[PDB]
Amino acid sequence: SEEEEGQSLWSSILSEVSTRARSKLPSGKNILVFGEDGSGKTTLMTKLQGAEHGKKGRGLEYLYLSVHDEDRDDHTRCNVWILDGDLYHKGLLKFAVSAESLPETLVIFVADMSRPWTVMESLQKWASVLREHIDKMKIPPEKMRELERKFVKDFQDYMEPELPLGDNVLTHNLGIPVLVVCTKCDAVSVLEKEHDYRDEHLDFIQSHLRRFCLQYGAALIYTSVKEEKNLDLLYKYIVHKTYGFHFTTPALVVEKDAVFIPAGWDNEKKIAILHENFTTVKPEDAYEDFIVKPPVRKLVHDKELAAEDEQVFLMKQQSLLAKQ
Amino acid sequence: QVIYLNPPIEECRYKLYQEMFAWKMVVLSLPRIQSQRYQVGVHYELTEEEKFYRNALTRMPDGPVALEESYSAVMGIVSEVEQYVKVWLQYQCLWDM
């Protein structure tokens, strides 16, 4: 009643007095890192958290990234809700990421070098899964449009770390930030030698991943667990995106091991210039243009050792004895 | 002069989820009976099926019913704890008003 309004007014005065603790962090910076199984994404996020674990069974994962905001001399915990690769377990994203935190969330996407073109395909599949998950939420479309507009403005806001709309810039205009992490970068020599992934083919794959990022309206970051490729830099970028930390990293696109370009560091033409390095592979070369996957291990199928039925062989031998 | 928390409420949630994961993994960790192990010829590494009943959750006899029940129970416990924690944290006005 009126006493409830008064107690809430006292709580509001407490919130006003909380300016001595306000804006320390937006509590609820929950980042979901979806994707496909087998990439060891739990290992990557655990390395990001500074802890160590591999005992992530099937289902959701609920790692707590402890943000170290030494700028404000405070701390916060980030809900790292990571989902498994079972599309049969797709009915789980409703438990962690919801519409209330939908504005307060950041998506991710993992990558594996073995079937990287298929990893691009699986990334597209999981992103479509996320799209459907956002779709079934079904909030006010005006609020979703406003969030998409704010995200688009942020995409335009990417000043260089010293206008016109793109053709398909955020073709997946979900409206929340997306950051695809190109994991399994330690197998570069494995791709080059064992998988015979050519240097031109590797550059074409990188350009295709960048094209997918732009289609989603997102950025890419090449990294590996052992090589430690911009891992703390990735943490800095994540804090800058969600928690609003002071980003300072400049774009680095010369190398390929840790190619972590945020938005605004490459438009369609700049990527095409990077894609102009693809000579043997066509500029419109598909994912299968350099994908290889031999059917190894020869899994069972031992010719199905069985003999004739008693009645069937009985009839056959009866006909034979009719002849004989 | 600040009502602290040891560990975070996120800490309580992470511990609860880990406990549920362990309880499920107890049954899910039974090693698969390698029938072809009597046969030889390929010394391949054990996959998830080789390690244990990896596809057990998929092959469960109630669809996603059990996983949905577990996630819902975790959500309910976390919600109750968070409501209690918010009610407890409301007293900070009594110190800073």
Swiss-Prot record, chain A:
Top-level lineage group: Eukaryota
Annotated GO biological process: cellular response to nerve growth factor stimulus; centrosome localization; microtubule cytoskeleton organization; microtubule-based movement
Coiled coil regions in record: none
Residue sites binding ATP per the record: G35, E36, D37, G38, S39, G40, K41, T42
GO molecular function ontology, one term from the record: ATP binding
One GO CC term on file: kinetochore
Primary site of residence: cytoplasm
Assigned keywords, A-Z: ATP-binding, Cytoplasm, Cytoskeleton, Dynein, Methylation, Microtubule, Motor protein, Nucleotide-binding, Phosphoprotein, Transport
Subcellular location field: Cytoplasm, Cytoskeleton
Membrane as UniProt keyword: no
Oligomeric form and interacting partners: Homodimer. The cytoplasmic dynein 1 complex consists of two catalytic heavy chains (HCs) and a number of non-catalytic subunits presented by intermediate chains (ICs), light intermediate chains (LICs) and light chains (LCs); the composition seems to vary in respect to the IC, LIC and LC composition. The heavy chain homodimer serves as a scaffold for the probable homodimeric assembly of the respective non-catalytic subunits. The ICs and LICs bind directly to the HC dimer and the LCs assemble on the IC dimer. Interacts with DYNC1H1; DYNC1LI1 and DYNC1LI2 bind mutually exclusive to DYNC1H.
Family affiliation: Belongs to the dynein light intermediate chain family.
Role played: Acts as one of several non-catalytic accessory components of the cytoplasmic dynein 1 complex that are thought to be involved in linking dynein to cargos and to adapter proteins that regulate dynein function. Cytoplasmic dynein 1 acts as a motor for the intracellular retrograde motility of vesicles and organelles along microtubules. May play a role in binding dynein to membranous organelles or chromosomes.
Descriptive protein name: Cytoplasmic dynein 1 light intermediate chain 2
Residues of the full protein shown: 27 to 373 of 492
Swiss-Prot record, chain B:
Disulfide bonds: none
Lineage: Eukaryota, Metazoa, Chordata, Craniata, Vertebrata
Top-rank taxon: Eukaryota
Protein's name in the database: Cytoplasmic dynein 1 heavy chain 1
Family statement drawn from the similarity comment of this UniProt entry: Belongs to the dynein heavy chain family.
Compartments, record wording: Cytoplasm, Cytoskeleton
Job of this protein: Cytoplasmic dynein 1 acts as a motor for the intracellular retrograde motility of vesicles and organelles along microtubules. Dynein has ATPase activity; the force-producing power stroke is thought to occur on release of ADP. Plays a role in mitotic spindle assembly and metaphase plate congression.
Subunit structure: Homodimer. The cytoplasmic dynein 1 complex consists of two catalytic heavy chains (HCs) and a number of non-catalytic subunits presented by intermediate chains (ICs), light intermediate chains (LICs) and light chains (LCs); the composition seems to vary in respect to the IC, LIC and LC composition. The heavy chain homodimer serves as a scaffold for the probable homodimeric assembly of the respective non-catalytic subunits. The ICs and LICs bind directly to the HC dimer and dynein LCs assemble on the IC dimer. Interacts with DYNC1LI1; DYNC1LI1 and DYNC1LI2 bind mutually exclusive to DYNC1H1.
Domain notes per entry: Dynein heavy chains probably consist of an N-terminal stem (which binds cargo and interacts with other dynein components), and the head or motor domain. The motor contains six tandemly-linked AAA domains in the head, which form a ring. A stalk-like structure (formed by two of the coiled coil domains) protrudes between AAA 4 and AAA 5 and terminates in a microtubule-binding site. A seventh domain may also contribute to this ring; it is not clear whether the N-terminus or the C-terminus forms this extra domain.
Disease listed for this protein: Charcot-Marie-Tooth disease, axonal, type 2O: An axonal form of Charcot-Marie-Tooth disease, a disorder of the peripheral nervous system, characterized by progressive weakness and atrophy, initially of the peroneal muscles and later of the distal muscles of the arms. Charcot-Marie-Tooth disease is classified in two main groups on the basis of electrophysiologic properties and histopathology: primary peripheral demyelinating neuropathies (designated CMT1 when they are dominantly inherited) and primary peripheral axonal neuropathies (CMT2).
Residues of the full protein shown: 967 to 1063 of 4646
Gene name of the record: DYNC1H1
